[PDB]
Write a protein that holds these residues in place. Structure first.
Motif, mmCIF file in Angstrom:
data_model
loop_
_atom_site.group_PDB
_atom_site.id
_atom_site.type_symbol
_atom_site.label_atom_id
_atom_site.label_comp_id
_atom_site.label_asym_id
_atom_site.label_seq_id
_atom_site.Cartn_x
_atom_site.Cartn_y
_atom_site.Cartn_z
ATOM 1 N N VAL A 79 35.409 43.763 38.588
ATOM 2 C CA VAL A 79 34.053 44.111 38.190
ATOM 3 C C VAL A 79 33.745 45.533 38.641
ATOM 4 C CG1 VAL A 79 31.627 43.468 38.257
ATOM 5 C CG2 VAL A 79 33.389 41.702 38.455
ATOM 6 N N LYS B 215 29.570 43.854 41.737
ATOM 7 C CA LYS B 215 30.491 44.987 41.780
ATOM 8 C C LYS B 215 31.529 44.855 42.892
ATOM 9 C CE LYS B 215 30.220 49.988 40.972
ATOM 10 N NZ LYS B 215 31.688 50.013 41.216
ATOM 11 N N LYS B 216 31.208 44.054 43.904
ATOM 12 C CA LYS B 216 32.082 43.870 45.057
ATOM 13 C C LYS B 216 33.348 43.087 44.711
ATOM 14 C CE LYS B 216 29.167 41.959 47.457
ATOM 15 N NZ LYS B 216 28.055 41.367 48.251
ATOM 16 N N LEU B 217 33.327 42.403 43.572
ATOM 17 C CA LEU B 217 34.450 41.570 43.155
ATOM 18 C C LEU B 217 35.536 42.389 42.461
ATOM 19 C CD1 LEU B 217 32.574 38.379 41.908
ATOM 20 C CD2 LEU B 217 33.493 38.923 44.172
HETATM 21 NA NA NA Z 1 34.748 46.397 42.072
#
Ligand code: NA
Ligand SMILES: Nc1ccn([C@H]2C[C@H](O)[C@@H](COP(=O)(O)NP(=O)(O)OP(=O)(O)O)O2)c(=O)n1
Ligand SMILES: [Mg+2]
Ligand code: NA
Length: 327
Positions: free
Chosen positions: A59, A54-56
């Motif tokens: 995403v 999720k950090k990307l």
């Molecule tokens: Na994100």
DNA sequence: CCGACGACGCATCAGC
DNA sequence: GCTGATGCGT
DNA sequence: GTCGG
């Protein structure tokens, strides 16, 4: 990185992308799933949690949860279901026929046409493009080794110089960037008597010459500036005949040529990234021109361009030769 | 909460 | 006949 | 579906 790092995830996302595009007709979901598939595929770590993913950039919450389920189980419930579904997978497969998009694909399935067998049984219902796309369903998915690309270039460059000495032909795409194999052939074409302020037969002559020497075999679309068709190398002796290949020929004004060359050389990942940098600095680039961005966001007139290098000599960047435009 | 998300040439289609 | 919309590939 | 106005 490596495929097998998060290859299971990227595949999972790519499958999801194709179903959005072809079955759901949600093109922006399809691009979303791919953007996530790309940014993850370049992320040099083995993703442990969906929250880590999720950090990307690209995403979000939905994919993050989708990754939780996949990592915990090795699959996706929604995806296994859509795979075994007769109607959705049939629709998804037919779009692989060039000429058949998601709309025509659902038409066929809705009236009971689900396979290539069904297509071949009902060729009258298909348009011209779709007949060719069906005819060469196999060939069109094979890749083209650089060796065959070079021979193709030989013919294209020779037949072009043969029609008119003053044509300027350039094979672009992944070929120019150096890729050892290519998906198709992208030819760019210009001529001193075609500019922005300028015969409507310049493209025609080239195409028909390539037809006479039996290089170009079929036509998907032909206009005054753009050609999409099929070509095949001449058979080598004993050796069994070559696969039919996709070929595009674009006629560009002389003054718009190097912007076009830059653009159709790619990669699109490279292009998408040059465009912004161009922004940051106050310039907007398209396939046609580079134009200065004014106080408001006003585009002035397109600047003079006489080389790819000239274009870097506007956004104050130093040349990156086609070899290294991997992205 | 809600709109952007890439844009263009060409073929066929909807409609007048 | 024509214009404009939609589908398609990229 | 994701990001950001
Ligand atoms: Na994100
Ligand atoms: N959707 C896309 C994809 C690419 N392009 C641009 C940038 C590409 O480098 C160039 C040629 O497109 P292309 O033939 O599909 N891709 P490329 O030759 O780079 O790799 P291949 O799959 O053809 O081997 O036009 C585009 O304008 N819209
Ligand atoms: Mg190419
Ligand atoms: Na298709």
């Amino acid at each position: 990185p490596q495929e097998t790092l998060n290859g299971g995830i990227t595949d999972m996302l790519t499958e999801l992308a194709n179903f959005e595009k072809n079955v759901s007709q949600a093109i922006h979901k399809y691009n979303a799933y791919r953007k996530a598939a790309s940014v993850i595929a370049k992320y040099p770590h083995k993703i442990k949690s969906g929250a880590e993913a999720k950090k990307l950039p690209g995403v979000g919450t939905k994919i993050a949860e989708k990754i939780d389920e996949f990592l915990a189980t090795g699959k996706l419930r929604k995806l296994e279901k859509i795979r075994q579904d007769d109607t959705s997978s049939s629709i998804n497969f037919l779009t692989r026929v060039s000429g058949i998009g998601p709309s025509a694909a659902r038409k066929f399935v809705d009236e009971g046409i689900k396979t290539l067998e069904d297509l071949r049984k009902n060729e009258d219902k298909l348009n011209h493009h779709q007949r060719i796309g069906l005819k060469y369903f196999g060939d069109f998915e094979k890749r083209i080794p650089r060796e065959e690309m070079l021979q193709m270039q030989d013919i294209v460059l020779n037949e072009v110089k043969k029609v008119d000495s003053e044509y300027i032909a350039t094979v672009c795409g992944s070929f120019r960037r150096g890729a050892e194999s290519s998906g198709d052939m992208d030819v760019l074409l210009t001529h001193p008597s075609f500019t922005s302020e300028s015969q409507p037969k310049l493209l025609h002559q080239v195409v028909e010459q390539l037809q006479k020497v039996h290089f170009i075999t079929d036509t998907l679309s032909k206009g005054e500036t753009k050609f999409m068709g099929v070509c095949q190398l001449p058979s080598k002796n004993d050796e069994k005949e070559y696969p039919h290949r996709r070929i595009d020929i674009r006629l560009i004004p002389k003054d718009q040529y190097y912007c076009g060359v830059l653009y159709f050389t790619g990669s699109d990942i490279f292009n998408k990234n040059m465009r912004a940098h161009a922004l940051e600095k106050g310039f907007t680039i398209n396939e046609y021109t580079i134009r200065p961005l004014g106080v408001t966001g006003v585009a002035g007139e397109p600047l003079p361009v006489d080389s790819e290098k000239d274009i870097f000599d506007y956004i104050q960047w130093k040349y990156r030769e086609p070899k290294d435009r991997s992205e």
